[PDB]
Amino acid sequence: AMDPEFMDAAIRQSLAKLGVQSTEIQASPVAGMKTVLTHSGVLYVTDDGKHIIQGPMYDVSGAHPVNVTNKLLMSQLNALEKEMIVYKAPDEKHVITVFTDITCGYCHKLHEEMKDYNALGITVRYLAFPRQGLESQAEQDMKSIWCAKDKNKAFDDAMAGKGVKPASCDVNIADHYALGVQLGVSGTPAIVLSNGYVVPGYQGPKEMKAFLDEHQKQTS
Amino acid sequence: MDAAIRQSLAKLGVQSTEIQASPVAGMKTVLTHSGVLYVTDDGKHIIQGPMYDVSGAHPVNVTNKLLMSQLNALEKEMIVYKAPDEKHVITVFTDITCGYCHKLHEEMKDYNALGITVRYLAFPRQGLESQAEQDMKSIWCAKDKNKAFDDAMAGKGVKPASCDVNIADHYALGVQLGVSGTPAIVLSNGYVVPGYQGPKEMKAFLDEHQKQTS
Ligand SMILES: [Mg+2]
């Protein structure tokens, strides 16, 4: 608190040379490296800022590798819960957070199946991840959806093909996009599980439920 | 010994061929058949390479810089086409069934004429035991390797041969360097330029790179 942070200052200064001007520096479990969040991804940086390596980092001590970068990011993820468009399941067995795009093919398929996911005990929470870019057709539309009085109704309507009624908001979609990139999201839909594990591509309700049951059993 | 690292890797089905120091205290550079992993001494944490030194004016990929030792150790099984007045040396992962590899090769004199020496290693895109692998094994086992390579590239067939070369060694090093296709051009500090590049473009990039890395 009254403790100076010379070394984190070296990290910021180093990244600045690389054009990376906005950073969030936290601890990493690897001795001599810090976790460094940027808009373009997570970087592991030595304390002195001289060596950099792209995330993610794995803990392989247990029976399966866990992505500790994503486990760490679950804190940032869960802290956007009031901006998530949530479809809760009656007796929740599992919660997933999906990065979605209203022009995304399998995002349409997934949303169509929302009832089936919910029937299986799976709650789905959406964050926005527009392919086209951080300033484009989908990105602006999704800002309007996210700022609606009833996000569920708005989202359902766009996905149904009814178009989107505009609105303006505190929410910056760019926050969702950066979290996604940090998590390693390389396209939509991107399904993020409770410990930050990002599922490879789309899984429908039956397969997802099966996978969630095992993921839960084999993660602490 | 690095027992903990090796134990961790074995749990994952990974085969280490070399474990050595890294710029990070308590973390090792681990060379595998699928790439370079950075692994803590205690066997617990892993980050996939490469690592970058960002202290100088320009970032350097230190993983590939380190790998240049492995690369240069293989100098005697490279097929070398030296430039009369050598100003740069590049190493090229090639495949005799790769279209741009023939384009690159047929311009060998023009690269040489600009002062660029080209050294080949084999990278059979279709993996080991493939026909490309076999033909290139035989090529690399010829007594006149340049004669054999030119002739295969010119369509005059490949004389069968056996020797100490194990193409898998070339392939693995390529994968470690980050080679994901042929031809792949490797500069004196391990920097990889993917795909064919013409003589003039290559000469320009080499001059820029040399200025940046001195
Ligand atoms: Mg640390």
Give all domains of chain A, ordered by start, each with its CATH number: 1-67 (3.10.450.70), 84-220 (3.40.30.10)
Other CB atoms within 10 Å distance of the CB of residue A16: 13
List the determination method.
Answer: X-ray
Q: What is the resolution of this structure in A?
A: 2.0
Whether residue A104 lies in the annotated active site: yes
Chain-chain contact of B45 with A55 (C-beta, under 8 angstroms): no
Distance of CA B180 to the CA centre of its chain: 11
Q: Degrees (nearest 5) of the Cα angle B11, B1, B41?
A: 65
How close A184 gets to chain B, by Cα (Å)?
14
Task: Tell me the CA–centroid distance for residue A44 and ligand 1, in Å.
Answer: 9
- Residue whose pair of structure tokens reads 């989202």 in the numeric block: A155
Are the beta carbons of B19 and B2 closer than 8 angstroms?
Answer: yes
Beta-bridge partner residues of B167: none
Other CB atoms within 10 Å distance of the CB of residue A176: 24
Are the beta carbons of A173 and A139 closer than 8 angstroms?
Answer: yes
Give which of A79, A162, A177, A71 is closest to A132, Cα–Cα: A177
Give which of A81, A74, A85, A95 is closest to A142, Cα–Cα: A85
Go through chain B and tell me how many residues it has: 214
CA distances from A45 to A9, A183, B19 (A): 12, 17, 21
Cα separation, A112 vs A130, whole angstroms? 19
Q: Roughly what angle, to the nearest 10 degrees, separates helices A68-78 and A173-183?
A: 160
Tokens standing for A34? Answer: 């810090």
Cα separation, A57 vs A30, whole angstroms? 9
CB contact, 8 Å: A59 with chain B? yes
Catalytic residue among A107, A141, A147, A213, which? A107
DSSP B118-178: EEEEE--TT-TTSHHHHHHHHHHTSSSHHHHHHHHHTT--------S--HHHHHHHHHHHT
Burial B102-128 (b: 16+ CB within 10 A, else e): bebbebbeebbebbbbbbbbbbbbeee
Distance of CA A65 to the CA centre of its chain: 19
CB contact, 8 Å: A76 with chain B? no
B173 Cβ partners below 8 Å, 6+ apart? B67, B70, B71, B74, B121
Other CB atoms within 10 Å distance of the CB of residue A45: 27
DSSP tag of A31? T
Whether residue A147 lies in the annotated active site: no
Cα separation, A197 vs A68, whole angstroms? 9
Are the beta carbons of B195 and B73 closer than 8 angstroms?
Answer: no
Give which of A28, A21, A87, A80 is closest to A57, Cα–Cα: A28
Q: What radius of gyration do chain A's Cα atoms show?
A: 19
Tokens standing for A205? Answer: 């309700």
Cα separation, A15 vs A11, whole angstroms? 6
CB contact, 8 Å: B56 with chain A? no
DSSP A54-105: ES-EEE-SSSS-EEHHHHHHHHHHHTTTTTSEEE--TT-SEEEEEEE-TT-H
Give which of B128, B110, B132, B108 is closest to B118, Cα–Cα: B108
Tokens standing for A75? Answer: 């804190």
Give which of A124, A133, A129 is closest to A102, Cα–Cα: A129
Give which of A120, A117, A116, A164 is closest to A140, Cα–Cα: A164
CB contact, 8 Å: B127 with chain A? no
Beta-bridge partner residues of A46: A33
If you count DSSP H runs as helices and E runs as strands, how many of each does chain A have, helices first? 8, 10
Q: Is B148 exposed, middle or buried (0-12, 13-18, 19+ CB in 10 A)?
A: buried
**Alpha-carbon torsion, ordered B140, B143, B148, B150, to 10 deg:** 100
Cα separation, A146 vs A150, whole angstroms? 9
Are the beta carbons of B111 and B150 closer than 8 angstroms?
Answer: no
Secondary-structure percent of chain B, ordered helix, strand, coil, rounded to 5: 40, 25, 40
Q: Degrees (nearest 5) of the Cα angle B166, B10, B39?
A: 90
Are the beta carbons of B193 and B187 closer than 8 angstroms?
Answer: yes
Cα separation, B188 vs B68, whole angstroms? 8
Cα separation, A78 vs A99, whole angstroms? 13
Are the beta carbons of B138 and B157 closer than 8 angstroms?
Answer: no
Are the beta carbons of A117 and A205 closer than 8 angstroms?
Answer: yes
Cα separation, B174 vs B180, whole angstroms? 8
Task: Tell me the CA–centroid distance for residue B86 and ligand 1, in Å.
Answer: 45
